[PDB]
């Protein structure tokens, strides 16, 4: 089953993640089928809000799932949002 997580790539201490979607089996560091953004909770610069909402709502409509702070991120960007 295909899931979505956050993929840090920074140095020993450079908490800079690339927001990434791919499936469960594969590692946190391998081949990402997709991807679609990046996140930096440490806040070195307000660039850290990167989500691709289109393919997001699509890829959740097909059968993917978030995770912890991915549930978080999704509630941030506006992917969980719906403004009734």
Residues that bind RNA (CB under 7 A): 1-3, 5-6, 8-9, 11-15, 23-33, 41-43, 61-63, 65, 67-72, 75, 78, 80-84
Side-chain-side CA neighbours of 84 within 13 Å: the count stands at 1
Select 32 or 50, whichever has its Cβ closest to RNA. Answer: 32
- CA nearest to 16, candidates 44, 56, 36, 35: 44
CB of 6 to RNA, least distance (A): 5
Neighbouring C-alpha atoms within 13 Å toward the C-beta of 53: 9
Minimum CB distance to RNA, residue 61 (Å): 6
Closest separation in Å from C-beta 18 to RNA: 7
Q: Quick one: which of 83, 55, 56, 84 has its CA closest to 71? A: 56
Please say which residue, 31 or 46, places its beta carbon nearer to RNA: 31
Residue at token pair 């295909």: 2
């Amino acid at each position: 089953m295909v899931k979505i997580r956050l993929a840090r790539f920074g140095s020993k201490h450079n908490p800079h993640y690339r927001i990434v979607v791919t499936d469960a089996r594969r590692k946190r560091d391998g081949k990402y089928i997709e991807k679609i953004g990046y996140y930096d909770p440490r806040k070195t610069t307000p660039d850290w809000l990167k989500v691709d909402v289109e393919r997001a709502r699509y890829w959740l409509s097909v059968g993917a799932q978030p995770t912890d702070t991915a549930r978080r991120l999704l509630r941030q960007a506006g992917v969980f949002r719906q403004e009734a």
